[PDB]
Design a protein around this ligand. Sequence first.
Ligand SMILES: CC(=O)NCCCCn1c2c(c3ccccc31)C(=O)NCC2
Length: 127
Amino acid sequence: SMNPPPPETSNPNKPKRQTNQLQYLLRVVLKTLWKHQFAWPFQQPVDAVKLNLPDYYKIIKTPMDMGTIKKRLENNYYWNAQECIQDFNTMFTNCYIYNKPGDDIVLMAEALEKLFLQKINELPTEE
Ligand SMILES: CC(=O)NCCCCn1c2c(c3ccccc31)C(=O)NCC2
């Protein structure tokens, strides 16, 4: 029923790159999803305490959220686009794994994931 530490957003000994696909992931993908009317449940780690979800971190062992992803992008945590794409997919999958099918939160994730897929379909070829 307690919150775990959040996912890592800083690690000096992880090698890093700043690149055109990662720049698109920030400027196009993350920013598109972040501004959406259904983004708010996804903008920070799940607070299982305040939200009264004592089983959340029993079920979800790979937490991920857009606040973490935004920090990772802005703070140059990633080596490649696939790492970031994986974080988005983990976020969506967690939502579908935890929640009751058909609930509002699932519909919210689906709306964001539709846009995610639309944007990553046009991920640029690397420079
Ligand atoms: C991103 C994520 O999966 N968070 C965990 C659930 C957070 C609490 N919560 C819920 C619903 C919901 C809807 C909107 C915000 C928070 C919500 C809803 O539809 N079913 C009940 C749970």
